């Protein structure tokens, strides 16, 4: 009755699909990182909304960050990945702009569709992103109008950090680019390496926004053991082996063989013990920190001879706590400490948000590292303040690395896409037409700011291109009022990362040409 | 088990982008399934059928019936090519991919946050000014003319698989459409499926095929002694029995006596011989009804030198009834002059593959034809039966609209610069929209040039250059070679009534599908 | 205005119908809206002293 | 201990709570298809029908509801249909919307009865305050009148275009079927309009068939199929053979009689074809059955007949040109006399071509002139949704025809009784003044939804809309601000009176009265019982 098609030439698949061709392959790769492109586009900008992203785990992750999102979807289109793993590059390298990444490469791959579907094919429509991306590194030199380098100090970058901030965080934007100007600032290298490791963020659940603060020290979540909590001297002995004895490594085995020997060892292993914390006492020691267990006896001559005993177990947190206060865990048991000692200005414990914290506070000299101590009513407000404190810390690593600054907030990406429409239009050949396709793509980044803000992109998108008129090359958005008139981005101060729009835009382009060079996609049987 | 408290039970709901820019993705994937079937390079896409035939073909329109879609937006664009398929013939392929092409562009400002009703009254603003672009780029067409008919209808089959055959299969498709061109009261009218019927045959050659000047069907004598071979026949036409029935009644007969049952036996009889003797009183010779024909009534016809033919259908009778000129009547004793066949001619019992097929032609002025087909096989018969369809209905529009439009490209481009020029007094929102129109008729010459293989960066940069002046406006493309030939040389032209459909309805299948923000899906009905 | 309102007033009507068909059986009526049960409660407290 | 019912039984604020939900998942459906800037939806069915509509009607009817309270509000868009017949998508979210802040109400422990006490004492004000405030009848606007209140109701729909062209139609076809009665009551049957459908060339081509349409063919392909000057004989009886009824029966005692039995069949089946056809009579309509043995006298006699028509055309044809129904013989024991006097007339009966099926069109019926629309689409489904915007936009003109009063449209009457029961619920306000303060919010839902669909400001574009109907009451200065509806595609408050934005009067008073009405019967569910369903015993 109803005959069926056969396999014709290759079907040797026990299960797997096969692609191959441009509408088959190169066509539905776009139109699957479009639906990327799509998704962040809401969350994209200051105005941006949160997503509850819920993963396999059964966990709540709210956030506007584009990093954090793309982390906890479990994307399984093998192009789409490739959008990911890009913004996942822009996040190692300066920790902030992932999410330009995806409305560019989602535009450029949107834009390349309109391209393979009335003219040429992907061995011009790559050849021609490539040269107008060469062009694109030689406008972003041009655009530098101010730079981070008079005045180093908590004024200047209170008013440089709110572009990270408020993108994220917009009521917060004067709160949060103040404690990240007393935390940045205060761990400087004196002309050398920016460490973002040295900036740790200790959530504590209770009030709002309001009552957090940055403490030149480290905040622990953990007990004493003791009845020294007070300690003004803080003279800080830090060990990394477990504190109660010094055993052997192979077996162990105590041999008696007569009644004095059975008698005296009980005795005199805890006069052992006593010399070891009377050695430590005499040196001026306070604290002792170490990294293991302790024994009931070291806990009892360290109540005798007044000295804190401090439990960390967790083996990172112990090499912080020596930069903090400038000591060396000795790995051996407790020597005569001659100069490798801490000197903190006051440890003590407090309370805070029905947690018991243990503070290791420098008053006199503050700088050595520090830790912002983050209030909130939710822990999942917690957790994306943390997200808005790391692009703080990453944008100080920018300002370390290149001190130029270009004027955001869509000042830029009209300046690009008028460049880049100048030299398409002075290419006399066929690759003219992907030339001022790439410049349309840099016009899309605009758009999303305007469509966050309720604010119709056609007009909107209509007076940046009268406002430039080859002189002006500074006003972006103002996404403040509806019917918006918008102003100058160096008077309002919205200028963040010309190394991160060096990078957004050199990963974006490698992301979207290396889609349309798959011709041919050979998947498997996933299990 | 207690119920859960729902309300609108197993059915879905979806609203927002998913449905506005979900019903483009359905309607681009249609558009691109019969792509490959526009211009002359095209090729035949074979079809599997639920009943366990094959339908390969290469018209837009006998491909999309053949598809069984679950998608609603996907039924809609099966439909606008059943209306083309019977408004006009060739008016198929190029509406589901302009259709296709309007929705491309009407996706790109659905994403501007543009209200779907302002892209709407710039397609209905759009849709009024390429009516009247067209009718100035028209030219009269002389009907009386044969040789310029038959360049109308070789422009509409060159896509066709016909196109080998094609000085045979235009001088077919001009003849059947003249010869059913019937008007009895003060209409005009032209009926090419009820009176040109198109009978294949399998065997033979395709070069044989050719349009009879009357009627045939696939019926034998009733009886060997009756006449094959009549030079001049008078055809009487009936409906009703020749035999004995029941009547509409309770009819019953009490027998009584010995000779009632032999009278009733032998007043059956009579009143088969009243009835035949009433039909031979205007001396015929070829007697045909829709209904049995009894054995009496066989006899009576036989030694009157009558040939009888015995369950023609009702639609050949109306066929044979114009070619003739006889009246179909259907009482035998109410026979008169006017309803007797005269003035057909040859009247032949032939046999073509051990099956006996009569033939009544060379009438004098027939008003229905049958278009004989022989071919190799029913496989290839039907493509040019579904070719032929598509050949005369385009004939038919001719003798309506005596209009013709460039072709090939050409009537695209001739609108696409009309609607450019007109939207620089536009000044306002509407404007964008309104010029995507004119970049959506571009999908037809890009066609014809990624059919066979041309450039279309080369191709249409100098085809809107021709199309910058106002004198020469007819340039299309050329799907032979692929180069930019002018139509007035080439000899491509459509009809003025295939062109307006096209793009009436594929702005208005865009009308429908763009107010579309909702999708209800999993309730019954009675 | 919809078939569940039509089947109430026919109801409401025949308890309207109904009251007046009490006073020609019976040409007396009391005080309403919780008068008589009060009565009856005070009545008959006395009544069982 | 408890009820021991085999169902189930949910008492409190839980109904209270399902019942407002029940009216808003209603709500939410179609508040997506009103007012121009309004979009149409699908209606797929487990079959594979699909239905693209946007009538509040047609949606509701077709959705699968459940819950009782659901039923309320499908069967209240069935009733505007018959009353008025363009009402249909706000009547819904105003009974919602009614729900939902009497439900704010009953949360504050206040007593339902005293929201529906305070819910007629606004809803009959709304009334009292529509009538006093229009602005003129049908006589200074005349035939402007006609064409800006149907393009009022075509704006939401298919036919929503910028020109004239279906306005112009409707107001000529009511305007044809001018049906007087007595007592003085000129009545518009817009049922008489015989809406038809093509899937054809596109909309602007749509005929407007001064006459009737007839959806029939011939039959036999024999007859004339265009007869000028016609005398149409509209009859209905089946023309078939003459069939004997179970009480008469055929019992024959001679073989000879035989035949002459069995051709009176026809022959009397015959005698009543040739005395209906001597009379000039050419065309001839029947409901019942013309055999094959009938169509031979019509043939060659050159007349028309039509056989198997509708019983509801046959009644709109005889009435437009003059002829007489008849079933049978008549006229006091008479053999056939068929009262030739009684015929029809026409000027033009002529089957044209409809995109290959067949079509019988009468011009002009010469005896009362009435209309009939052929409509022509793209596709099936855009001709049954241009027959359903068509017979909304009949019904427009019909109610502005018979009673001569129309209010303005586009949100400009709730914005008036928006501020009027504000200031009414403060003057005899003691109990029961915050139920008809919450009407007053409940009836700015209309305007509250032509400002979402249209991705306008909300809540700036109806703050405007109310700023000028608040200085139209407060400020007698003749100020004339009681038109002032909304600009949809521009986004300001216009003047509805210059821009030709007409509504009827009973389209919004008839909805006030039945979603007031419905919102009374849903606030009386604080107890619901659901019994088991008995299938299967
Ligand atoms: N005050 C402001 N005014 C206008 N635009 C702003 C303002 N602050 C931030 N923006 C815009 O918001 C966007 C936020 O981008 P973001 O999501 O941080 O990129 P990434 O994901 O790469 O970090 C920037 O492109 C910037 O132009
Ligand atoms: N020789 C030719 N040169 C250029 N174009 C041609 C030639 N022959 C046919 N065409 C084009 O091919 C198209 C075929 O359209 P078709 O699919 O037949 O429409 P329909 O489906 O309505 O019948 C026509 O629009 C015509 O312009
Ligand atoms: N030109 C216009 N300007 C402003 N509002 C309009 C315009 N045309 C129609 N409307 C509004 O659109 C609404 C459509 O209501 P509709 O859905 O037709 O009600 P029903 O379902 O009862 O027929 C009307 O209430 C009217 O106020
Ligand atoms: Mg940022
Ligand atoms: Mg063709």
Redesign the interface.
């Known amino acids: 009755?109803?005959?069926?098609?056969p396999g014709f030439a290759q079907m040797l698949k026990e299960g797997a699909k096969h692609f191959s061709g441009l509408?088959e392959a190169v066509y539905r790769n776009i139109?699957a990182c479009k639906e990327l492109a799509?998704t962040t586009r809401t969350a994209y900008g200051p105005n941006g909304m949160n997503k509850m992203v819920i993963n396999h785990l059964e966990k709540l992750f709210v956030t506007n960050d584009a990093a954090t999102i793309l982390r906890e979807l479990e994307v399984q289109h093998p192009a789409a990945k490739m959008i990911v793993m890009a913004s996942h590059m822009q996040e190692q390298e300066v920790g902030d702009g992932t999410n330009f990444v995806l409305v560019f490469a989602g535009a450029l791959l949107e834009l390349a569709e309109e391209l393979l579907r009335?003219?040429?094919s992907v061995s011009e429509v790559i050849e021609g992103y490539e040269i107008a991306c060469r062009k694109a590194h030689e406008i972003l030199p041009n655009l530098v109008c101010c730079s981070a380098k008079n005045l180093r100090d908590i004024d200047e970058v209170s008013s440089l950090l709110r572009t990270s901030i408020m993108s994220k965080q917009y009521g917060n934007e004067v709160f949060l680019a103040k404690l990240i100007a007393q935390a940045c600032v205060s761990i400087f290298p004196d002309s050398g390496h920016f460490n973002v490791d040295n900036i740790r963020v200790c959530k504590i659940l209770g009030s709002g926004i309001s009552s957090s603060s940055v403490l030149h020290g480290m905040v622990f979540k953990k007990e004493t053991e003791g009845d020294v909590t007070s300690v003004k001297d803080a003279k800080i002995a830090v060990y990394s082996c477990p504190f109660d004895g010094m055993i052997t490594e192979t077996k162990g085995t105590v041999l008696i063989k007569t009644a004095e020997e059975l008698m005296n060892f009980s005795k005199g292993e805890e006069n052992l013990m006593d010399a070891q914390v009377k050695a430590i006492a005499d040196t001026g020691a306070n604290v002792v920190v170490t990294g293991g267990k302790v024994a009931d006896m070291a806990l009892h001559y360290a109540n005798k001879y007044n000295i804190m005993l401090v439990r960390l177990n967790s083996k990172w947190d112990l090499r912080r706590l020596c930069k903090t206060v400038g000591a060396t865990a000795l790995p051996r048991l407790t020597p005569p400490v001659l100069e490798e000692m801490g000197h903190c200005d006051s440890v003590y414990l407090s309370e805070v948000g029905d947690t018991q914290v243990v503070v290791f506070k420098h008053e006199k000299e503050d700088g050595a590292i520090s830790t912002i101590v983050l209030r909130g009513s939710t822990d999942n407000l917690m957790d994306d303040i943390e997200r808005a404190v790391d692009d703080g810390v990453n944008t100080f690593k920018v300002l370390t690395r290149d001190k130029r600054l270009v004027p955001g907030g869509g000042a830029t990406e009209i300046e690009l896409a008028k460049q880049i429409t100048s030299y398409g239009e002075t290419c006399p050949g066929?690759e003219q037409?992907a030339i001022k396709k790439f410049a349309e793509a840099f016009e899309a980044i605009p758009?999303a700011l305007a469509?966050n803000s309720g604010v119709?992109?056609?007009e909107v998108i209509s007076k940046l291109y009268a406002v430039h008129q080859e002189g002006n090359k500074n006003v972006g958005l103002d996404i403040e009022a509806?019917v918006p008139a918008v102003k100058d981005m160096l008077e309002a101060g919205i200028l963040d990362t010309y190394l991160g729009k060096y990078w957004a835009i050199k990963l974006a382009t490698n992301a979207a040409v290396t889609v349309l060079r798959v011709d041919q996609i050979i998947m498997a049987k996933p299990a | 088990h207690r119920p859960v408290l729902v309300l609108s039970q197993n059915t879905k709901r979806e609203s927002g982008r998913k449905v506005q820019s979900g019903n483009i993705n359905a309607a681009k994937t249609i558009a691109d399934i019969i792509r490959t079937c526009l211009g002359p390079k095209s090729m035949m896409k074979m079809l599997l059928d639920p009943m366990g035939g094959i339908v390969m073909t290469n018209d837009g329109n006998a491909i999309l019936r053949e598809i069984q879609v679950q998608h609603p937006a996907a039924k809609s664009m099966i439909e606008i090519s059943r209306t083309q398929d019977e408004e006009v013939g060739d008016g198929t392929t190029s509406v589901i991919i302009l259709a296709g092409e309007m929705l491309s562009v009407a996706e790109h400002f659905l994403e501007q946050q543009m209200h779907p009703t302002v892209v709407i009254s710039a397609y209905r603003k759009a849709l009024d000014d390429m009516i009247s672009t067209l009718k100035k780029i028209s030219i009269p067409v002389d009907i009386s003319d044969s040789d310029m008919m038959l360049n109308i209808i070789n422009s509409s089959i060159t896509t066709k698989a016909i196109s080998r055959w094609s000085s045979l299969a235009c001088n077919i498709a001009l003849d059947a459409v003249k010869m059913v061109q019937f008007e009895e009261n003060g209409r005009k009218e032209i009926d090419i499926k009820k009176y040109a019927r198109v009978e294949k045959i399998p065997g033979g050659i395709i070069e044989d095929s050719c349009v009879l000047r009357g009627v045939m069907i696939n019926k034998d004598v009733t009886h060997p002694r009756m006449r094959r071979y009549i030079k001049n026949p008078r055809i009487v036409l009936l409906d009703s029995s020749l035999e004995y029935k029941k009547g509409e009644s309770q009819t019953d007969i009490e027998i009584t006596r010995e000779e009632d049952f032999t009278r009733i036996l032998q007043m059956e009889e009579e009143y088969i011989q009243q009835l035949c003797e009433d039909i031979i009183q205007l001396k015929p010779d070829v007697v045909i009804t829709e209904k049995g024909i009894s054995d009496l009534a066989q006899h009576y016809l036989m030694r009157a030198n009558i040939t009888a033919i015995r369950r023609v259908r009702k639609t050949d009778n109306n066929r044979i009834a114009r070619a003739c000129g006889a009246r179909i009547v259907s009482r035998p004793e109410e026979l008169r002059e006017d309803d007797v066949g005269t003035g057909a001619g040859l009247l032949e019992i032939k046999k073509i593959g051990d099956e006996y097929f009569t033939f009544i032609t060379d009438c004098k002025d027939p008003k229905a034809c049958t278009i004989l087909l022989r071919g190799a096989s029913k496989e290839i018969l039907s493509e040019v039966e579904r070719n032929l369809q598509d050949a005369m209905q385009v004939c038919r529009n001719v003798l309506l609209d005596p209009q013709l439009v460039p072709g090939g490209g050409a009537s695209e481009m001739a609108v696409a610069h009309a609607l450019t020029e007109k939207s620089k007094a536009m000044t306002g929102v509407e404007q964008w929209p309104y010029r995507a129109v004119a970049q959506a008729l571009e999908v037809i010459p890009r066609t014809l040039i990624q059919n066979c293989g041309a450039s279309t960066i080369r191709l249409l940069t100098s085809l809107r250059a021709k199309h910058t002046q106002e004198n020469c406006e007819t340039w299309g493309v050329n799907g032979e070679t692929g180069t930019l030939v002018d139509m007035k040389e080439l000899g491509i032209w459509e009809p003025l009534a295939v062109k307006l459909q096209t793009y009436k309805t594929a702005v208005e299948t865009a009308v429908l599908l763009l107010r579309i923000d909702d999708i209800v899906s999993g309730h019954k009905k009675k | 205005s919809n078939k569940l309102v039509i089947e109430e007033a026919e109801r409401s009507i025949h308890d309207a119908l109904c009251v007046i068909r009490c006073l020609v059986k019976k040409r007396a009526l009391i005080a309403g809206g919780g008068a008589p049960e009060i009565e009856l409660a005070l009545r008959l407290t006395e009544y069982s002293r | 201990g408890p009820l021991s019912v085999f169902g189930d039984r949910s008492t409190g604020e839980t109904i209270r709570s399902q019942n407002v939900m029940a009216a808003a998942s209603i709500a939410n459906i179609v508040k997506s298809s009103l007012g121009p800037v309004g979009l149409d939806k699908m209606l797929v069915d487990d079959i594979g029908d699909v239905t693209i509509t946007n009538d509040g009607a047609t949606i509701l009817k077709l959705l699968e509801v459940e819950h009782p309270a659901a039923k309320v509000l499908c069967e209240l868009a069935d009733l505007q249909d018959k009353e008025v017949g363009d009402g249909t998508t706000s009547v819904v979210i105003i009974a919602a919307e009614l729900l939902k802040n009497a439900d704010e109400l009953v949360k504050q422990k206040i007593h339902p009865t005293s929201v529906i006490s305070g819910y007629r004492l606004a809803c009959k004000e709304a009334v009292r305050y529509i009538n006093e405030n229009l602005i003129v009848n049908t006589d200074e606007l005349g035939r402007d009148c006609l064409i800006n209140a149907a393009k009022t109701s075509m704006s939401s729909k298919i036919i929503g275009i910028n020109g004239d062209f279906f306005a112009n139609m409707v107001v000529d076809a009511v305007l044809a079927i001018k049906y007087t009665d007595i007592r003085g009551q000129p009545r518009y049957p817009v049922n008489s309009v015989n809406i038809l459908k093509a899937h054809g060339r596109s909309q602007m081509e749509s005929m407007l068939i001064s006459g009737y349409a007839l959806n029939c063919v011939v039959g036999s392909q024999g007859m004339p199929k265009r007869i000028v000057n016609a005398k149409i004989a509209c009859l209905d009886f089946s023309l078939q053979k003459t069939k004997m009824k179970l009480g008469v029966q055929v019992v024959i005692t001679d073989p000879e009689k035989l035949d002459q039995i069995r051709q009176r069949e026809s022959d009397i089946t015959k005698e009543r074809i040739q005395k209906i056809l001597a009379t000039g009579a050419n065309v001839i309509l029947t409901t019942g059955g013309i055999d094959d043995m009938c169509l031979k006298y019509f043939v060659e006699a050159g007349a028309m007949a039509v056989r198997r028509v509708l019983k509801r055309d046959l009644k709109r044809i005889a009435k437009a040109s003059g002829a007489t129904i008849l079933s049978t013989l008549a006229n006091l024991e008479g053999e056939e006399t068929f009262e030739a006097a009684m015929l029809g007339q026409a000027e033009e009966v002529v089957q044209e071509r409809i995109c290959d099926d067949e079509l019988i069109l009468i011009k002009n019926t010469k005896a009362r002139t009435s209309a009939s629309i052929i409509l022509r689409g793209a596709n099936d489904f855009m001709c049954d949704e241009m027959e359903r915007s068509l017979h909304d936009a009949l019904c427009v003109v019909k109610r502005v025809l018979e009673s001569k009063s129309v209010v303005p449209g586009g949100g400009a009457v709730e914005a008036a009784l928006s501020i009027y029961l504000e200031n009414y619920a403060t003057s005899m306000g003691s109990r029961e003044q915050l139920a008809i303060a919450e009407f007053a919010r409940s009836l700015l839902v209309i305007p509250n939804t032509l400002a979402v669909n249209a991705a306008q400001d909300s809540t700036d574009l109806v703050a405007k809309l109310r700023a000028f109907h608040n200085e139209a009451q407060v400020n007698p200065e003749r100020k004339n601000l009681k038109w002032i509806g909304l600009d949809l595609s521009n986004g300001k408050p216009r003047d509805n009176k210059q821009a030709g934005v007409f509504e009827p009067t009973i389209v919004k008073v008839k909805s006030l009265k039945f979603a007031t009405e419905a919102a009374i019967t849903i606030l009386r569910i604080d107890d619901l019982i659901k019994l088991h369903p008995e299938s299967k015993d």
């Open positions: 009755h109803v005959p069926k098609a509408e139109q799509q009335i003219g040429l066929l037409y758009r469509e119709k992109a056609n509806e």
